[PDB]
Design an enzyme around this catalytic site. Structure first.
Site, PDB file in Angstrom:
ATOM      1  N   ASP A   1      -0.407   5.450  -5.755  1.00 17.87           N
ATOM      2  CA  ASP A   1      -1.239   4.311  -4.483  1.00 17.87           C
ATOM      3  C   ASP A   1      -1.128   3.828  -5.549  1.00 17.87           C
ATOM      4  O   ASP A   1      -2.119   2.994  -5.904  1.00 17.87           O
ATOM      5  CB  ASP A   1      -2.112   5.637  -4.418  1.00 17.87           C
ATOM      6  CG  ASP A   1      -3.128   4.738  -2.523  1.00 17.87           C
ATOM      7  OD1 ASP A   1      -2.706   3.249  -2.969  1.00 17.87           O
ATOM      8  OD2 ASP A   1      -3.659   5.444  -2.864  1.00 17.87           O
TER       9      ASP A   1
ATOM     10  N   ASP B   1       1.103  -0.804  -0.081  1.00 17.61           N
ATOM     11  CA  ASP B   1      -0.136   0.161   0.056  1.00 17.61           C
ATOM     12  C   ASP B   1       0.458   1.282  -0.156  1.00 17.61           C
ATOM     13  O   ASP B   1       1.585   1.415   1.279  1.00 17.61           O
ATOM     14  CB  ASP B   1      -1.284   0.168   0.931  1.00 17.61           C
ATOM     15  CG  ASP B   1      -2.558   1.028   0.763  1.00 17.61           C
ATOM     16  OD1 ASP B   1      -2.003   1.933   0.112  1.00 17.61           O
ATOM     17  OD2 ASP B   1      -3.240   1.430   1.701  1.00 17.61           O
TER      18      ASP B   1
END
EC number: 3.4.23.4
Length: 320
Positions: A216, A34
């Site tokens: 991201d 992440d």
């Protein structure tokens, strides 16, 4: 000191997860690596929520190295919330052994968000500026102890969706074509930088001016300001489905425009096949709407991404 490679498995282009081992002797978990958060956590035995029961739960009772620390952890990922407690234990990511690593052990995961997700926990890769109080991001500990040979990691995501890789402390020229273009990080919290323009055929349709964007790996779509996204949805041919979404005629691909992001003076086009996702007989649009642009998996599947903490740079190269 080291290079670790972690094969990632993909739950159908929506999450990009991998195996880590926690505790002594090690217990196995699947986690979402992440780049849009900095905290690390896995479900525990103290978690009674249904999502927890449908996943791997860390049993500290069986680990000789565990040590409660007690500090709380609340992470609000819009989608679902997670409450837990911080503790310490050894983590193993490939060959790299990360001792006395703080890790969150859920206590409450209410709701369906986490039940149906394919990962057990989240391993945060953004800056310590983002991490919760008393939590040390995993890469930062690795770095701090010279556990990786270089203070960089590299994300390869395969569009053919089966040999996706996270490489710690190394760049692999074989997963990209051409050269790497290094882009400086403007604000060190997310991995953020400046996009110059989004054009369709020399016409600027978004981000007129420059806009900030983050890379991201924990977002599946390309997400933007809804004014800018709406214009992109008209331009490519996208209509709103009854379900509250944007669909694309799967047999209209050949005529749709390519969308180009101009990052630090280079152009990173996004072809129709690249921002068009097809599941079963219906096709959906890659672009979604929320000021900051979020370049999700839609972009990273096309551009092999290096995150370099020694220099605070993002390096982009066209994916193979």
């Amino acid at each position: 000191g080291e290079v670790a490679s972690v094969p990632l498995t993909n739950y159908l282009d929506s999450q990009y997860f991998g195996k880590i081992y926690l505790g002594t002797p090690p217990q196995e978990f699947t986690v979402l690596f992440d780049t849009g958060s900095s905290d690390f956590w896995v479900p525990s035995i103290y978690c009674k929520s249904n999502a927890c029961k449908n996943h791997q739960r860390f049993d500290p009772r069986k680990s000789s190295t565990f040590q409660n620390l007690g500090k709380p952890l609340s992470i609000h990922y819009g989608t679902g919330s997670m409450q837990g407690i911080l503790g310490y234990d050894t983590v193993t990511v490939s060959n790299i052994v990360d001792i006395q690593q703080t890790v969150g052990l859920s206590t409450q995961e209410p709701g369906d968000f986490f039940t149906y997700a394919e990962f057990d926990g989240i391993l945060g890769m953004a800056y310590p500026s983002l991490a919760s109080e008393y939590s040390i991001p995993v890469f930062d500990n690795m770095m701090n102890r010279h556990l990786v040979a270089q203070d960089l990691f590299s994300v390869y995501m395969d569009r053919n969706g089966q040999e996706s890789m996270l490489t710690l402390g190394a760049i692999d020229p074989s997963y990209y074509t051409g050269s790497l273009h290094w882009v400086p990080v403007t604000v060190q919290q997310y991995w953020q930088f400046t996009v110059d323009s989004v054009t369709i055929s020399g016409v600027v349709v978004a981000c007129e001016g420059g806009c900030q964007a983050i890379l991201d790996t924990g977002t599946s779509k390309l997400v933007g300001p809804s004014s800018d996204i709406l214009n992109i949805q008209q331009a490519i041919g996208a209509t709103q489905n009854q379900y509250g979404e944007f669909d694309i005629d799967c047999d209209n691909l050949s005529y749709m425009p390519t969308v180009v992001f101009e990052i630090n003076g280079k152009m990173y086009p996004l072809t129709p096949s690249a921002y068009t996702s097809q599941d079963q007989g219906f096709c959906t649009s890659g672009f979604q709407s929320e000021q900051k642009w979020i370049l999700g998996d839609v972009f990273i599947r096309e551009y092999y991404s290096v995150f370099d903490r020694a220099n605070n740079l993002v390096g982009l190269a066209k994916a193979i």
